[PDB]
Amino acid sequence: VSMTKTSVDCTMYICGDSTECSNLLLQYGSFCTQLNRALTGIAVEQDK
Amino acid sequence: ALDPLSETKCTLKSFTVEKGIYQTSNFRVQPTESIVRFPNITNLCPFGE
Numbered sequence: 001v002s003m004t005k006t007s008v009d010c011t012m013y014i015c016g017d018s019t020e021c022s023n024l025l026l027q028y029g030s031f032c033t034q035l036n037r038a039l040t041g042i043a044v045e046q047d048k
Numbered sequence: 049a050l051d052p053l054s055e056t057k058c059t060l061k062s063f064t065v066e067k068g069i070y071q072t073s074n075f076r077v078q079p080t081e082s083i084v085r086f087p088n089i090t091n092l093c094p095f096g097e
Contacts, residue, residue, distance in 0.1 A: 009074060036071070 005043040010035045
C-alpha cells in the first residue's frame with residue numbers, strides 16, 4: 001500500500017557546508033527546487 | 049525574511065498563501081567554536097640542506 005516517505009535536501013547533499021559550492025549551484029537554477037516538489041508529491045500520494 | 053508567513057510567500061513566489069503546510073528552509077545548527085588538537089613539533093624542516 002504505502003512506501004517509505006523520503007525528503008531529500010538537494011542544497012546540503014550537493015554542497016556540504018560550502019559557500020563557494022553553493023554559489024556554483026545557483027548557476028544551475030531551480031533544478032534543486034524541482035526535486036523537492038517531485039519528492040513532496042510522492043510523500044503526499046503515500047498518505048492517499 | 050521578516051516573519052515565518054513572509055518566508056512562505058517568497059517560497060511560493062506568491063502574495064497569497066493557501067491553507068496547508070509548506071516547507072520553507074532547513075534548520076542550521078552552527079558550531080560553537082573551532083577546536084584544534086595537533087601534535088607538538090618545535091623543529092624546523094631542513095630546507096637549507
